[PDB]
Design a protein around this ligand. Structure first.
Ligand SMILES: Nc1ncnc2c1ncn2[C@@H]1O[C@H](COP(=O)(O)OP(=O)(O)O)[C@@H](O)[C@H]1O
Ligand SMILES: Nc1ncnc2c1ncn2[C@@H]1O[C@H](COP(=O)(O)OP(=O)(O)O)[C@@H](O)[C@H]1O
Ligand SMILES: Nc1ncnc2c1ncn2[C@@H]1O[C@H](COP(=O)(O)OP(=O)(O)O)[C@@H](O)[C@H]1O
Ligand code: ALF
Ligand code: ALF
Ligand code: ALF
Ligand SMILES: [Mg+2]
Ligand SMILES: [Mg+2]
Ligand SMILES: [Mg+2]
Ligand SMILES: [Zn+2]
Ligand SMILES: [Zn+2]
Ligand SMILES: [Zn+2]
Ligand SMILES: [Zn+2]
Lengths: 334, 32, 360, 343, 367, 364
């Protein structure tokens, strides 16, 4: 939970409202992963639960600060999925709602934090509406999500939206170069792959994901000339399949844009691969493959219990079939 | 193929043609 | 402590509601004529006043003066109902009480007489979330309730209710509020709150509301919070990311000319400036619709757009209507799938690349 | 520990009586016969007291321990019978069985019934504790290849004459269910005192009560017998098997076949079988499969399987069995015009 | 004051609307004396299953005797009407679905009726019983005591076990047609001394599908809206149905391929503020009706007689292919309506698309 | 009154039982030779005579003359068993009594000698509803049964019982009664009851029975009620039409032959009763898929569709595969477009019209 510099302005705004008492009881933060929205929410929660606030920061010595540091504050609630599960059920929401009715142990504000509103099931989202509309006095809700459009409309209408804008590209590149050592092209490509959000690129670099991306690029470079797309299975069949599918889609989009003629491409560190993709494939086939890859990624991320290997194998065989002449290509439709 | 047919295909509109016109019982007057 | 505009300005009288004239007239006529049903259902979109009207009806039924369509608002029953602590008004949150056991327990107590009021009113909210067993258990008592109980149901998805339940109650459908009504309500609220505002900001907020008054109030609260306590045109435009300049016209012209480099450059510039992609797509759709409209009749072009008439007429004359329809369909498809793409910019680029292929 | 089959159990019992007997298998008839033989021999030896318990999470082990510890005034030589769960013993059951084996007496005769144990189940403290003083009887239902010999022998020991057609009908109607087949033989003997069982006679008093498993269906698909595959699928549907299990079992073999077909263009099949760890007996059938399905096929099958999986998972459809039948016919050499494949 | 649905429950076999076969069978059984011990009633909602069951109970337990025409005036009939008859045990299976309740009920079936000659158990919503509850009734239902009768009513008969179905006589009630519903509404309104008009009653009957309870609820709502009267304008406003003349004129203008008339009609509709999705639905319905008329001359119903001739004209002129093309175009337009910038904009774009691809007179091609 | 046909015509002798020869002959031979097992189980479909045969066997076991397959029917034991007052015959409704405590008291009576019978007979029906503890108690009782007690079990779901219970009893499976035997039994019953009838009505009732005699008797009672004391072809046909619920196959047959009037009539009949249009489309799609599979291989059709086997076989034999594929694709498109149609009924009608007269145009 690092505190990034670009969170300084936004915080200074939000807390200001809470100083004047003009604070909405339901705040929804829209931010890409790695933007540090969790740190902002934690800072706001610490400010709200401090018994002796000074300025815009908690004192750090009152009983509330000590309990927050120990992580055993009675009036602080967190709604997150179980360790083995992936969605947030309705039982937890109901228990939190029933617990919110009684008075606070320390006689102060009560803070409830939802780690990710996109993981709420339909039943949980519907159950939360009544509590969110008319919460008891001195109760604050914090929600974070990537795409507000994915949330329930009724739930969305009850919240105040705050959007975090990623910093400018040059500042992000300078910050990344300061944090880690790498070539400028690699840093720029990592930043663009993460939709311009710093920290996500740092997450890519610090881990072994870069080696996986290099392996995928080599496999695709081998496959494109020969035409054996089945060999990519080993490079895609993994628990992190959506990210690799996104990388492949980005490569296809870069190749298509290069064919059409453009000055900016997401993958700036691999001109040869995109050049080969543009040379060896026609625009219609590129569009069809891109659409199929996006659809399969969405199916993998959405459907629960779906088999990864079967879907990837079917996708690769379908792409190989599409590469054959005289095959009707899919057309988007409602 | 015809330009209009291709445009209708892109728009997602399917075109239906008579296959057993004797089934219809009425003064369809399709031919003019 | 502090209450948001949505909670503060909940209507407390039949004359304080906006729109929904037919429902109010029907309820008033029913109350006046003495024909009172035992099962009312309210359907409509979100934030249209289903719960408000249900609470107003409940208050009118149990008023001390009598069964009237104009509650006094000063007797003990009215005040207690307004405060939400009235004994004979039982409000159930069906979204968290879906269990059939709770429904059976509730039904087992209908035989008891009301404590203070002349009727025992049950207000079930989000009734569409109940289980099948709950609906089946309700059916029998809902058909023939005792003489001293009433049922009020509010839902936003009436399709999910079984036909048997729908057959047993009088249904009232609430229309989505018009832009003018929302604008007038916002202006009245701001005037009562002593907050400076401008007509264009109100127009933009009403347009962005999309027929929901709760959404309009939430947007107004956000604008007030983010605009140092003042509602101004620039603040609202920045919040909503209004296109303002004719970027959409240039983008659609580049798309029609099938010049990929120009389209990509414009998209890159827009991304650098950080605009909202949904607004861009909506503006492009509007421009395409206007161009199609002008082709049918030259006079169809609006007078408010008397700044780009030459380019619009050039596009209308040069492009056949079928290509306009194809572009409109492509942009609609792109708008539909935008939230499901890995990134908004990626989805917009995919849509534009697909559209660029419709050129011989 | 001694290892035996049901036929040698009586000979072993005549040789002597051991302390513990383990009956592991999936055939109720053979398990019942072995249990009856063991109990009869024990009663002959002087075991007139028998107790039976069912192993489950809600089990009273205190009663069993008290029975083992306590003595008897006159009715000594006790016999204890345990019925293991279908899934098999777990760690708690493992330690309970170890404790029970610790409290073992010469006058207590232990018998255990359950499904065949795996290597993990076999490698347990209680199992090894009984190794030096136990005999395990394996009771596995014979396959279709060895079934007719078993039927002929069983009819012979009952003093009955069976024709070849009658034997084939009995095997077909009661495949995988030996209890039903034995009861059918008994009913036929009751019906005809003369003991002459011809085809028309047996055909009148026989009903279809076969039992199958998904592996049988997959083997039938590999061989290419449409009738047998459809019959097995119908029986599985009647039983109430989970479609997902069938989907996974078919998926494993289908993906293996796809990979082998792709990589067999420039490699002998024997090397591929060795590299993929294919069992020697199966290598036959797999071979003919690769000589019956082309690369154009095995892609439509994969597409149909993926579509069926998606329909089952997200759409919660009820037409899974129809798609399974279509895929079964597709694997066999049939036109399958592809309107139903959505290809 | 009192709700129409509860006030006008039939109390004699003559008051039942439709269901002729079931009533005839019950009357013949009662007259001949061949009375079963297990009856099942099936049908859609609000067709009179409970009413017929109660009438059968009255006939069985009437003081005069076992007759198909209950007097309706003796103590038993009045008590059954008021729901206070001791020997008519009414069970709400939807509420008591547990096997314990079923066992408690079965433990007291051998006791004689208190006052009547039969003890009648009327189980409603029997499809909600548990599997154990269903299996617990098999033997008692198969061989009940002499003085015990079972009446079952449900809207989802296929969920019952086949064993239960084999033990009872099944009667399937059928949905009522428009004529019967309209006649019943006319009779009820005449008895209530409420003014009405034929067109309003026809609209209410058509909007109620084949359920009388829905028709009565709609009638109550219209009376409330109309302030003591049932007027065609009030009912039209309540149902949100536009005049068929405007929709037919729009369809004719679209067919003629004259954009000016279509735009004028759209502007006129916008002046009133006609719902646009409803307009699309009405146009689709008119096109479907024209296609059906082309298929069969008798497809057209009576309610459209006012425009029938006009419809026939189109059926004599428009080829089926053009009708199919228009229907598909409007269906796609409705499909894409939610994502358009505005409903008016979406409808206008759909109509412009239909005009552009007109089979005979497309919009002029640019030079 | 006249009683009910099902109750009045209980088979009181082995000769009165219709069919089921493979069971009655075996039971008679076993009784004659003295080869009697400890536990008997009876399985089959509904209304095939499991309880009747169990009661007949119980009566035969405890007859005064002796253990015979032809009970006299005149001694006190036979009359008491027929009237259900026999002390040594204990009939247990396992469905009503499932808890272990209820079963324990009944099973503890095996420690008392019979009062006035050679054997103490327990007839447990609906035995598949017992709980695990009840099954354990029953198994413990059956492990060491006294020589003077017999157990008779009847159920329609033998797979629900534990394998341990199954392995210790002899099982007899009853078959369907077939059309001819049902028709003969109905004719005999009506002749005994002095009720006018016609051959066509009896054939229709037997065909609608679907292998169950109790269903046939219930339908006969309903027809007699509808016909006002008489069974006639027109009355029975009208009654069956009222209960007819197979509009999908009729619609498929009408569509395949291009008969619009029949299609409209079937649609009206389906709309008369409460039906789900999407369910009807799904049923039609399933029927078309089954026909295609049968065309691919005759073994595709199983015993689950024995009722409509002939019609499906005829459709498969007559219709070319291409027409079946075209209809299947048209119905798929119709189901896809149904939600956005002006009405469900209108959508179904439009799809049926397109299948009848129109043919889609495919790209390229
Ligand atoms: N018709 C209306 N008139 C005035 N205010 C309204 C109306 N409808 C909604 N609102 C405002 O929206 C807020 C929420 O409305 P609500 O009662 O939740 O409607 P719904 O139950 O349809 O969501 C209220 O606090 C009220 O201020
Ligand atoms: N056949 C009918 N004749 C007269 N009124 C009917 C008929 N069917 C339904 N109704 C009316 O509908 C109301 C509800 O019917 P109900 O008893 O609920 O039928 P069901 O049990 O099928 O739902 C009754 O009060 C009655 O006035
Ligand atoms: N084989 C048969 N012969 C004559 N009548 C039969 C036969 N099977 C069933 N029935 C008739 O069906 C009725 C009910 O049979 P039942 O004893 O319930 O069989 P099950 O126990 O299989 O349901 C009996 O009254 C009997 O008249
Ligand atoms: F949309 Al609501 F209560 F918030 F009906
Ligand atoms: F009471 Al009903 F269908 F609503 F029988
Ligand atoms: F009594 Al049954 F099948 F209904 F044996
Ligand atoms: Mg509400
Ligand atoms: Mg009812
Ligand atoms: Mg029985
Ligand atoms: Zn502090
Ligand atoms: Zn008041
Ligand atoms: Zn009377
Ligand atoms: Zn006798």
């Amino acid at each position: 939970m690092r505190w990034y510099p670009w969170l300084r302005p936004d915080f200074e705004k939000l807390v200001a409202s809470y100083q004047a008492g003009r604070g909405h009881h339901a705040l929804l933060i829209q931010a890409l992963p790695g933007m540090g929205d969790d740190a902002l929410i934690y800072a706001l929660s610490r400010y709200l639960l401090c018994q002796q606030p000074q300025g815009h920061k908690s004192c750090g010595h009152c009983r509330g600060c000590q309990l927050m540091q120990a992580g055993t504050h009675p009036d602080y609630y967190t709604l997150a999925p179980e360790k083995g599960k992936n969605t947030l059920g309705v039982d937890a929401v109901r228990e939190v709602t029933e617990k919110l009715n009684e008075h606070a142990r320390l006689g102060g504000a009560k803070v409830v934090w939802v780690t990710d509103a996109a993981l709420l099931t339909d039943a949980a989202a519907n159950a939360l509406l009544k509590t969110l509309e008319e919460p008891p006095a001195e109760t604050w809700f914090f929600l974070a999500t990537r795409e507000p459009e994915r949330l329930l409309a009724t739930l969305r209408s009850r919240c105040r939206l705050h959007y975090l804008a990623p910093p400018p590209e040059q500042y992000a590149v300078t910050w990344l170069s300061r944090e880690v050592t790498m070539s400028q092209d690699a840093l720029l490509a990592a930043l663009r792959l993460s939709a311009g959000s710093p920290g996500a690129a740092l997450a890519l670099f610090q881990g072994d994901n870069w080696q996986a991306r290099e392996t995928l690029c080599q496999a695709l470079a081998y496959s494109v000339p020969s035409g054996d797309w089945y060999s990519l299975l080993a490079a895609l069949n993994h628990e992190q399949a959506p990210a690799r599918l996104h990388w492949l889609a980005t490569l296809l989009m870069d190749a298509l844009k290069r064919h059409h003629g453009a000055a900016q491409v997401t993958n700036v560190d691999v001109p040869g691969l995109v050049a080969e993709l543009a040379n060896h494939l026609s625009p219609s086939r590129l569009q069809a493959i891109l659409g199929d890859v996006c659809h399969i990624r969405e199916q993998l991320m959405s459907v629960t219990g779906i088999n990864r290997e079967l879907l990837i194998t079917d996708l690769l065989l379908r792409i190989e079939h599409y590469l054959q002449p005289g095959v009707v290509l899919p057309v988007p439709h409602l | 193929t015809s330009r209009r047919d291709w445009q209708l295909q892109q728009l997602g509109i399917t075109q239906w043609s008579l296959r057993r016109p004797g089934a219809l019982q009425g003064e369809i007057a399709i031919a003019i | 402590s502090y209450q948001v505009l949505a909670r503060k300005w909940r209507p407390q009288t039949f004359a304080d509601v906006v729109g929904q004239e037919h429902v109010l007239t029907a309820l008033a006529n029913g109350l006046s004529l003495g024909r009172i049903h035992h099962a009312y259902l309210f359907s409509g979109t979100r934030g249209v006043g289903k719960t408000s009207i249900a609470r107003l009806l409940a208050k009118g039924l149990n008023c001390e003066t009598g069964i009237t369509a104009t509650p006094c608002g000063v007797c003990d029953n009215c005040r207690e109902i307004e405060q939400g602590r009235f004994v004979d008004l039982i409000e159930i949150d069906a979204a968290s009480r879906t269990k059939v056991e709770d429904t059976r327990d509730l039904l087992d107590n209908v035989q008891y007489a009301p404590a203070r009021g002349r009727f025992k009113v049950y207000l079930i909210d989000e009734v569409h979330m109940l289980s099948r067993h709950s609906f089946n258990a309700l059916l029998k008592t809902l058909e023939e309730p005792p003489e001293h109980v009433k049922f009020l149901l509010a839902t936003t998805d009436p399709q999910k209710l079984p036909v048997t339940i729908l057959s047993r109650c009088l249904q009232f459908h609430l229309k989505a509020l018009d832009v003018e009504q929302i604008r007038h309500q916002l202006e009245h609220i701001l005037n009562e709150e002593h907050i400076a505002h401008e007509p264009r900001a109100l127009q933009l907020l009403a347009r962005a509301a999309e027929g929901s008054l709760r959404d309009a109030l939430s947007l107004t609260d956000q604008a007030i919070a983010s605009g140092d306590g003042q509602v101004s045109t620039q603040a609202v435009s920045a919040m909503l990311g209004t296109l303002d300049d004719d970027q959409a016209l240039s983008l659609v012209e580049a798309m029609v000319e099938a010049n990929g480099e120009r389209v990509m450059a414009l998209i890159n510039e827009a991304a650098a400036r950080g605009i909202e992609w949904e607004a861009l797509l909506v503006e492009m759709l509007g421009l395409l619709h206007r161009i199609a409209m002008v082709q049918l009749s030259p006079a169809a072009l609006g007078n408010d757009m008397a700044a780009i008439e030459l380019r619009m007429r050039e596009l209308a004359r040069t492009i056949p209507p079928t290509d306009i329809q194809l572009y409109y369909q492509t942009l609609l498809i792109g708008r539909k799938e935008l939230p499901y793409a890995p990134d908004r910019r990626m989805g917009v680029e995919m849509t534009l690349l697909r559209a660029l292929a419709f050129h011989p | 520990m001694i290892r035996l089959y049901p036929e040698q159990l009586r000979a072993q019992l005549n040789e002597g009586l051991r302390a513990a007997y383990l009956l592991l298998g999936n055939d109720p008839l053979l398990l019942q016969e072995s249990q009856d033989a063991v109990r009869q021999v024990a009663a002959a030896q002087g075991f007139e007291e028998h107790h039976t318990f069912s192993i489950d999470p809600n089990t009273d082990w205190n009663a069993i321990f008290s029975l083992c510890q306590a003595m008897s005034l006159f009715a000594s030589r006790q016999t204890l019978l345990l019925l293991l769960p279908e899934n098999g013993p777990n760690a708690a059951i493992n330690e309970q069985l170890l404790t029970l084996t610790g409290l073992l007496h010469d006058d207590l005769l232990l018998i255990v019934r359950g499904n065949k144990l795996s290597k993990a189940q076999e490698n347990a403290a209680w199992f090894t504790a009984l190794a030096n003083r136990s005999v395990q009887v394996t009771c596995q239902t014979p396959e279709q290849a060895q079934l007719p010999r078993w039927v002929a022998a069983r009819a012979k020991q009952l003093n009955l004459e069976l024709d070849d057609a009658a034997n084939q009908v009995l095997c077909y109607c009661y495949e995988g269910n030996l209890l039903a087949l034995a009861q059918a033989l008994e009913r036929l003997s009751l019906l005809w005192p003369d003991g002459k069982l011809t085809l028309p006679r047996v055909e009148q008093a026989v009903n279809d009560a076969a039992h199958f498993t998904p592996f049988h269906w997959v083997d039938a698909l590999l061989m290419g017998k449409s009738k047998r595959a459809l019959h097995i699928l119908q029986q599985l549907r009647l039983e109430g098997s989970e479609p997902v299990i069938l989907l996974r079992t078919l998926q494993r073999e289908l993906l293996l076949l796809v990979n082998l077909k792709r990589q067999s263009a420039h490699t002998p099949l024997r090397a591929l079988f060795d590299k993929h760890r294919v069992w020697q007996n199966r290598r036959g059938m797999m071979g003919e499969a690769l000589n019956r399905l082309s690369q154009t096929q095995l892609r439509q099958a994969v597409q149909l399987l993926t579509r069926t999986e998606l329909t089952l998972k997200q759409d919660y459809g009820q037409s899974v069995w129809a798609e399974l039948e279509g895929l079964s016919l597709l694997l066999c050499h049939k036109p399958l015009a592809d309107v139903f494949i959505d290809g």
